[PDB]
């Protein structure tokens, strides 16, 4: 009967796990850092290479395209050849790994994802560094499990989580968001786990330090201190949330449906794929010149949008164009996350809402910049369905804590309507699609 087991041995993680966490984070850190420098380096080359042909305009549009095209192809190949399970974000893959329904083939994925994404990201494709770093991170966590031979579901699941954590952290300089990601979303939320949160911390800390040893003194998003949000204004954030809530599943459809439509194009053939890859990757580096705002990570237009420097027109355009380029890049298996491009999508849509609100309510003394920041993690709420993670992610990056109530509202408002209009966590719908082809 033994109606006890009681309470002491809560928060009692084995010292061995805790040390291994430290090493996992440190690796995922440097790994993330190195990856990050690489992508920069390569974008820079194509920037310099566009100078050797800055007079001949049509030869420029060519050297941009082909340049990103060649890098795209390299990445798409490195995936289809050596590790197919390292396409897309790779978060669903790491999630499955926690349910023991997917393997962590680190010996393959690490170099595949690293150099793979390093190519897609490098060409200036519309993908985020999270995909790579999160997965790379997760695997790095398993690598050290193996190399040190650690018994127990605890050790396995913990070091795998803290890897994916330290990975997301290093991708945004977002320590809290990393930890929150696991606990809020990334935990196998069908039953309890042996994921030691104390370890995840250690991992995230070490990783974040590693990131800050190198890429620091400068922020990924600078927005300055935006204004405040008067209580009589909050309703406007529930409205915006609802909008993200209805659009959330609609976008979730397209990402999914687009994977399908793009599969036909190549049939699964590693040549038509790698070619169609370099076609989009080429389109990106081309678009990343003729209009930089429709291509790339999106961390650029964020400040420019929040400040309201874009006209209402240029916003709607940037939105449509980025909906297109985001799908083409992600849905087509290219290694690299969809988080970052979702932040930009949300920023852009929030700003647009702000724009309108500003001229409908001069009484409220609005600044569109606040609706931008509320909207930033709103697509992450209505599509990944991980609002607490996105809300802390934005708050850690944009630093406008006075907007916490409005952000929480837009977030919830999105998560709610995403549910009620019949949508589902995108990183779950993808693992579900992958396990439904394994069994069906």
């Amino acid at each position: 009967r033994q109606l006890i087991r009681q309470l002491l041995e809560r928060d009692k993680t084995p010292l061995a796990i805790l040390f291994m966490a430290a090493v996992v984070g440190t690796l995922v850190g440097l790994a993330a850092v190195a990856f990050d420098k690489g992508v920069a380096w390569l974008q820079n080359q194509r920037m310099g290479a566009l100078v050797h042909t800055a007079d001949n305009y049509p030869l420029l549009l060519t050297v941009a395209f082909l340049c990103s095209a060649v890098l795209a192809m390299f990445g798409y190949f490195l995936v289809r050849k050596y590790a197919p399970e390292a396409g897309g974000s790779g978060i669903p893959e790491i999630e499955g790994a926690l349910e023991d329904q997917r393997p962590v083939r680190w010996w393959r994925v690490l170099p595949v994802k690293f150099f793979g994404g390093l190519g897609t990201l490098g060409g200036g494709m519309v993908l985020g560094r999270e995909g790579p770093t999160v997965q790379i991170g997760g695997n790095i966590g398993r690598m050290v499990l193996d190399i040190f031979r650690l018994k127990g579901d605890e050790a396995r699941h913990t070091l795998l989580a803290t890897g994916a954590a330290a990975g997301l952290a290093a991708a945004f300089n977002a320590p809290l968001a990393g930890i929150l990601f696991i606990i809020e979303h990334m935990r196998p939320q069908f039953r309890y786990t042996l994921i030691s949160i104390k370890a995840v911390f250690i991992g995230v800390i070490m990783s974040t330090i590693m990131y800050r040893i190198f890429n620091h003194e400068v922020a990924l998003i600078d927005v300055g201190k935006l204004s405040d949000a008067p209580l009589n204004t909050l309703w406007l954030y529930l409205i915006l949330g609802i909008i993200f809530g209805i659009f959330g599943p609609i976008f979730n459809k397209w990402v999914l449906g687009m994977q399908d439509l793009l599969h036909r194009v190549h049939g699964g053939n590693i040549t038509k794929w790698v070619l169609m890859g370099g076609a989009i990757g080429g389109l990106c580096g081309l678009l990343g010149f003729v209009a930089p705002a429709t291509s790339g990570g999106g961390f650029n237009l964020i400040p420019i949008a929040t400040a309201g420097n874009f006209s209402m027109g240029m916003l709607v355009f940037i939105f449509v164009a980025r909906v297109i380029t985001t799908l083409l890049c992600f849905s087509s298996g290219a290694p690299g996350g969809i988080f970052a491009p979702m932040l930009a999508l949300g920023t852009v849509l929030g700003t647009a809402f702000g724009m309108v609100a500003v001229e409908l309510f001069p009484q409220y003394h609005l600044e569109a910049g606040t609706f931008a920041i509320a909207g930033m993690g709103a697509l992450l709420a209505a599509s990944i369905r991980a609002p607490l993670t996105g809300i802390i992610l934005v708050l850690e990056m944009t630093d406008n804590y006075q907007l916490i109530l409005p952000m929480i509202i837009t977030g919830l408002g999105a998560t709610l309507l995403a549910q009620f209009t019949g949508g589902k966590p995108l990183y779950s719908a993808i693992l579900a699609r992958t396990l439904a082809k394994q069994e069906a």
Partner: antibody, heavy 120, light 107 residues
Framework: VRLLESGGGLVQPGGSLKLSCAASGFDYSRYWMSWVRQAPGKGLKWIGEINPVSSTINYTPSLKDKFIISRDNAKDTLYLQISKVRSEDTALYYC??????????????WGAGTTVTVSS | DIVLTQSPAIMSAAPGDKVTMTCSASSSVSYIHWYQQKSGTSPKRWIY???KLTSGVPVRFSGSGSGTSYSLTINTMEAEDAATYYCQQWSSHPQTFGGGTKLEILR
């Protein structure tokens, strides 16, 4: 926390003058700043507001550049320049720092005024 | 632009009296504020959001009202209240002030 308007006085009809209130004792950015009039022994009448980053500047029902409200956060100073001054502009000009409770904005802290006299 | 019109233009009263002046709005306004303008001084934020007192305003004062009618009430006026008071709304841009009620003291 003080507001000190100035550069009022005598203007000839059709002339123009730059009123200018100097703020101090509070972070002058983060604050919407406003201008209110009071004609001799009459009632308060709002002129215009301006946000911290000078990107939103509303005026009362007026003309082309009847009023032009600027703001220099480097100097914590607010400017109002009335042009083509007719005699209804003969008034006391207050600069007011703006704020809200629940959200409907009020004129938080008022200056001491400057008088502008439209005469020959 | 809501037109606000205030109770009496001028009103006498003797310290001790309960005093009420009212603010009437053409259209419908919510959360109005009141300003006290003592002679030769500048307006001071007295009552705001209909019935909240600006820190430093004595408890003798109170605000109220709703549709197109609002009131500032001094419960047992004091002689030191001699001032012109102005109601103002900003629930519909552009904000607008009343004409003022000049409270005179009987003594």
């Amino acid at each position: 926390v003080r507001l000190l308007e100035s550069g009022g006085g005598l203007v000839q009809p059709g002339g123009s003058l730059k009123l200018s209130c100097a703020a101090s004792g509070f972070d002058y950015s983060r604050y919407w700043m406003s201008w209110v009039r009071q004609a001799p022994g009459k009632g308060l009448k709002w002129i215009g507001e301006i946000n911290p980053v000078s990107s939103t500047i509303n005026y009362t029902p007026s003309l082309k550049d009847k009023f032009i409200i600027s703001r220099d956060n480097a100097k914590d100073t607010l400017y109002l320049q009335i042009s083509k001054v007719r005699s209804e502009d003969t008034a006391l000009y207050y600069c007011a720092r703006l704020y809200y409770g629940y959200g409907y904005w009020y004129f938080d802290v008022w200056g001491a005024g400057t008088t502008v006299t439209v005469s020959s | 632009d809501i037109v606000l019109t205030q109770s009496p233009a001028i009103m006498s009263a003797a310290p001790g009296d309960k005093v009420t002046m009212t603010c009437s709005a053409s259209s419908s306004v919510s959360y109005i504020h009141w300003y006290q303008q003592k002679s030769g001084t500048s307006p001071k934020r007295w009552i705001y959001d209909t019935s909240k007192l600006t820190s430093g305003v004595p408890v003798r004062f109170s605000g109220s009202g709703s549709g197109t009618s609002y009131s500032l009430t001094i419960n047992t006026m004091e002689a030191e209240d001699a001032a012109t008071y102005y109601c103002q709304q900003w629930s519909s841009h552009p904000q607008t002030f009343g004409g003022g009620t000049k409270l005179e003291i009987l003594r």
